[PDB]
Amino acid sequence: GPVKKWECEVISNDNKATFIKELKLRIPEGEVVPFRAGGYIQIECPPHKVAYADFDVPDEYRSDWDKFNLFRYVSEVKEPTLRAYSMANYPEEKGIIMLNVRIATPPPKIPDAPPGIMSSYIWSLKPGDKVTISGPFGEFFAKETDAEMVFIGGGAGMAPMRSHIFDQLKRLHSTRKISFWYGARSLREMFYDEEFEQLARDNPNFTFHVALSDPLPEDNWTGHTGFIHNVLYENYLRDHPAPEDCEFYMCGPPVMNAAVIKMLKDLGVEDENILLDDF
Ligand SMILES: Cc1cc2nc3c(=O)[nH]c(=O)nc-3n(C[C@H](O)[C@H](O)[C@H](O)COP(=O)(O)OP(=O)(O)OC[C@H]3O[C@@H](n4cnc5c(N)ncnc54)[C@H](O)[C@@H]3O)c2cc1C
Ligand SMILES: Cc1ccccc1NC(=S)NCc1ccco1
């Protein structure tokens, strides 16, 4: 039972945030990748050498790239490798595989480490390039109950978050109470917000909340500030009659995963009601 593979063509590879690209791949026509919301594929790369200076980083994000001297990096790979990336589209969005891919730069305290192999390769891709994906795979699946669902996301965790939420509202036509809580550093780091706002207008049972930890003055931000674990508690769980009866679905950067799960455990939520997708 060898894993299925598809050679896909790159449609677009646009920044959605300073350090996240939306890689959109065209599935070969007439074919289906039979994935589930929350699932993922693997991408492979050939041997290559790519310069960060050749990345298509748009106007709104170049100042930070220049500030951290990121355009100097080069990534050289002599052997093919594989990495997993989660679908941001949901299964009824046919014909494409949408990914959200964080650029895995060298650590700040070890800035001369090799850049991340597969994310650097992905960020080098241009429309018309070909990439081979394999799978699909999955473990981060929704529980099918009537319980309230609480989705918490950060960074590239937006991908399974979007997949899950669209799957509930558009394919399952779910009437369950569903809320999505997304933490980001500032306004330019938020994406897909218009989609979720439209979903909230069309689905009374769905609500969407963004917390910005470090909003810029020019963001003109009057929404919630701080970290998403505190915003979720202070603006919702603190007067929820029974948070323990909720299903929590977590996917963010490690610091956010830990802080949210600690908050939930401190509320008495049982491990069985907390599902984590750790990238
Ligand atoms: C099921 C699953 C789903 C995932 N979904 C997503 C997703 O949707 N989006 C996403 O962006 N990621 C996702 N990930 C993570 C993804 O698979 C990769 O791990 C990620 O892209 C980084 O891989 P890389 O090849 O770019 O970096 P790697 O080459 O694996 O390097 C990782 C980090 O280590 C650093 N490093 C390397 N060598 C050294 C050294 N000597 N000293 C110090 N530091 C060093 C690199 O600079 C880099 O920051 C997922 C992972 C899993 C398991
Ligand atoms: C990681 C991250 C990404 C985007 C926006 C904010 C954050 N920071 C977080 S979630 N910090 C958690 C926290 C606060 C105190 C202890 O842990």
Residue numbers in the entry: 127 to 405
What does the primary publication say about this deposited structure?
One of the first academic collaboration FFCS projects was performed on protein crystals of two homologous bacterial enzymes. The two crystal systems relied on different precipitants, PEG and high salt, and both crystal systems had to be adapted by a distinct post-crystallization treatment to cope with the addition of large amounts of DMSO in the soaking procedure (Stegmann, Sharpe et al., in preparation).
For both projects, the 500 most diverse fragments (selected based on the structure descriptor FragFP) and 50 project-specific fragments were selected from one of the FFCS pipeline fragment libraries (Maybridge Library Ro3, Thermo Fisher). Once the soaking conditions had successfully been optimized, for each of the studied crystal systems two to three days of intermittent laboratory work were sufficient to perform soaking and crystal harvesting (∼250 crystals per day). The X-ray diffraction data sets were collected on beamlines PXI X06SA and PXIII X06DA either manually or with the SDU software. Data sets processed with adp (with the in-house XDS-based gopy pipeline) were fed into dimmer workers which calculate F o − F c difference density maps and generate fragment coordinates. The entire fitting and evaluation method will be described and exemplified in detail elsewhere (Stegmann, Vering, Steuber & Fritz, in preparation). The hit rates for the two example projects were very similar, at 6.2% and 6.4%, respectively, and showed well defined, tightly bound fragments.
